[PDB]
Ligand binder design. Structure first.
Ligand SMILES: NC[C@@H]1O[C@H](O[C@H]2[C@@H](O)[C@H](O[C@@H]3[C@@H](O)[C@H](N)C[C@H](N)[C@H]3O[C@H]3O[C@H](CN)[C@@H](O)[C@H](O)[C@H]3N)O[C@@H]2CO)[C@H](N)[C@@H](O)[C@@H]1O
Ligand SMILES: NC[C@@H]1O[C@H](O[C@H]2[C@@H](O)[C@H](O[C@@H]3[C@@H](O)[C@H](N)C[C@H](N)[C@H]3O[C@H]3O[C@H](CN)[C@@H](O)[C@H](O)[C@H]3N)O[C@@H]2CO)[C@H](N)[C@@H](O)[C@@H]1O
Lengths: 265, 265
């Protein structure tokens, strides 16, 4: 009646998580079952399974409710500017729309957070410095991004009971997909610098909706389902949670090909 | 349509919070209204109002779900011992039963947390070291406790939209009250030391229920209501939240006298 740090690490090993892996986690903590330490049991079991050579990652994003006040060019009206809290990678809370684990991971001692606010990842472990260094502010889901570094390092993504449409790495596949009609989001973001608040415009492919028209908003779940149905990845229980584990480079290439087949040439 | 760091500090000043105050906060963040930075706007406004000479405090407690496995002497059965996460004052999460603000305060850079797990307070500011140092493990709501140091320093308690029965300092009044039939809670707690897990028995007056029989479980709210009805304390809005501000030494003495009149001699 209690999933422990030991039992969860055993479930993670049986699922496919290995010593030295860089693992990115999307979790629905309620579905794991009753935990002795709450979400920190999940974090501890992941660190135990990958060892000091591994790295645990999560999608942090940023809690910035000021997006309801921007006009049409994405800037902030002058009456609201100095009221918007600027982004500090060490103090800005992770978004909690898709669960509380990224914030729990962000506040775990040793965790590093990248510089692109809306696309920030948290990393804890051996390669946390490289995974979070020099995050390009424009198109933060693309070439120089932590999501690209996860693919390059041969990392893995674990859907720990979370809905399959929340896989952030598939936004990296959307950025890479050579297709037409890609939607773009522009917004101004306040940054905290040792001299005050400095504003800056951010450009990236819009990850608030499907990258192109004609797709259901949860269509990431279909891509993951087809990926598993093709005999790739592994499925199994983590505690009481139905979980999915995929290779980062494989699911990205599968996601790009999924898009380049139905759209473009 | 947006309570800001500036507007909240103005509401706090109008309520009675002053420069240099040591303020302990019980908050219901949802009732404050729409915040630009979430709960961190409340923390920032409190720090702004009290200044670098002040101190912001909250009741942290401890997220320890292992209390359902103890027998009748309060110890942990041998099969569960090494599975229970030990208490680390720097890493143990604050309880979130009465809101998320204590955990947000605990993870704010610079905040210190005291050593008594179940009675731990978080402190951020000038006297955070003294407020959290040398917390007596047995009877942690009594003489050497942060709640007693708050009374000694002339601190204040702010009920920021929270229910009035959640005022932790009234447990210090229960400990001090010279009355009969005081209930006692005993439990064993794992502690993290630089050499491993060390277990220890904790004794204190039971704060999970009224200190004596014959009291409704929310009777703290009646004491606060009588205290305000007697012309003491101040009431007003903090954002959109009906709030209460009281002097720590006054509400404690009023709480003790409230108990010593209806019970004992
Ligand atoms: N969905 C409709 C659209 O949502 C936008 O805002 C959305 C946006 O801020 C935000 O979208 C966020 C992005 O930020 C972030 N960079 C990646 C993350 N996957 C995404 O999340 C969203 O897309 C996922 C599906 N991949 C869903 O599983 C998830 O529940 C959903 N919140 O959530 C809001 C609602 O989804 C705009 N309101 C408007 O373009 C339109 O209303
Ligand atoms: N209430 C019934 C009793 O609750 C106990 O457990 C309780 C205990 O762990 C815990 O009680 C906690 C204490 O820890 C902590 N040290 C101080 C805090 N004010 C108190 O909180 C409790 O008392 C307040 C009223 N002052 C309420 O406002 C609050 O909602 C309530 N959770 O919440 C649990 C439920 O209240 C035991 N289950 C049993 O003795 C009996 O069932």
């Amino acid at each position: 009646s209690f999933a422990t740090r030991t039992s969860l690490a055993a479930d993670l090993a049986a699922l496919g998580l290995a010593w030295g892996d860089a693992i990115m986690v999307h979790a629905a903590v309620s579905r794991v079952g009753r935990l002795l330490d709450g979400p920190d049991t999940i974090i501890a079991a992941l660190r135990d399974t990958v060892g000091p050579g591994g790295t645990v990652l999560a999608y942090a994003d940023w809690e910035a409710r000021y997006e309801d006040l921007v006009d049409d060019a994405g800037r902030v009206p002058p009456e609201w500017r100095e009221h918007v809290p600027p982004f500090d990678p060490q103090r800005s809370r992770a978004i909690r729309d898709n669960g509380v684990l990224p914030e729990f991971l962000r506040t775990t001692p040793g965790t590093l957070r990248s510089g692109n606010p809306g696309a920030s990842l948290v990393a804890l472990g051996a390669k946390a410095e490289w995974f979070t260094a020099d995050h390009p502010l424009d198109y933060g889901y693309g070439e120089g991004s932590p999501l690209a570094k996860l693919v390059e390092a041969g990392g893995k993504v674990l859907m720990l009971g979370a809905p399959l449409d929340t896989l952030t790495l598939l936004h990296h596949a959307e950025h890479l997909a050579d297709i037409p009609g890609k939607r773009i989001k522009r917004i101004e973001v306040p940054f905290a610098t040792p001299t005050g608040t400095q504003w800056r415009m951010i450009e990236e492919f819009d990850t608030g909706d499907p990258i192109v028209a004609g797709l259901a908003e949860d269509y990431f779940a279909g891509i993951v389902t087809e990926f598993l149905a093709s005999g790739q990845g592994r499925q199994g229980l983590i505690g009481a949670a139905p979980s999915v584990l995929v290779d980062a480079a494989a699911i990205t290439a599968f996601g790009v090909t999924w898009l380049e087949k139905r759209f473009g040439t």
